[PDB]
Symmetry: C3
């Protein structure tokens, strides 16, 4: 099957040379969303990677893989770290 045999090999070769380059060209795009009160939400299309809280509060949980909730009493602000991937080119 010589041609369809060889074309596929050239595709595999070409792909292998160019994939890792195309993977180094993508990055993590992260920003913070902060709100007064006990909740801060990441937008659709992003993941929540961490939370931060005012008033020294280290105790948080993430609700529905979207919303940072700070647990301590009378919290003044909540912040979520939101990330998605970005092609840098």
């Amino acid at each position: 099957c010589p041609i369809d045999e060889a074309i596929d090999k050239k595709i595999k070769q070409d792909f292998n040379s160019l994939f890792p380059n195309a993977i180094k060209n993508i990055g993590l795009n992260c920003w913070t969303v902060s709100s007064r009160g006990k909740l801060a939400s990441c937008p659709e299309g992003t993941a929540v990677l961490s939370c931060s809280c005012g008033s020294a509060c280290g105790s948080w949980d993430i609700r529905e893989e979207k919303v940072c909730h700070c647990q301590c009493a009378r919290i003044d602000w909540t912040a979520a770290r939101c990330c998605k991937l970005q092609v840098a080119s």
Copy 2:
């Protein structure tokens, strides 16, 4: 080195459009592993991105890039944020 050059060009061209398409189809898949006590670990194939602690404790460290360790004397629970890449297709 003729017909192979034309084919090489077509492979590279198709790759340049398919690469970005397929990469933006990948997101971060994150979840939380919690435990009573001062340690919570992420499973094989995941990275640890952050930790949370009970008792308002904001002091933590990650051991062996796997285990969240909450450092305060008082710790009711420990939580790790664990992530890996995920095709959303």
Copy 3:
């Protein structure tokens, strides 16, 4: 297809696309998150160029931090023993 005007070019195009559709997912298994922590005495810890800051930790039980310029973890409480930044990048498994 539907009556290819360039039969060979189209046959090859479809082979390229088909191949990419198997080559890509198998190649993507080999890429992951390279994360580490950068720690410092004082109130600031920064991540190096080419990485993102994902979270911060503070000494003295302080849970209040902010990231400056998407590079520097800042612990906000009045007294802080130390500051740590969680830094990550995407990376091909070599």
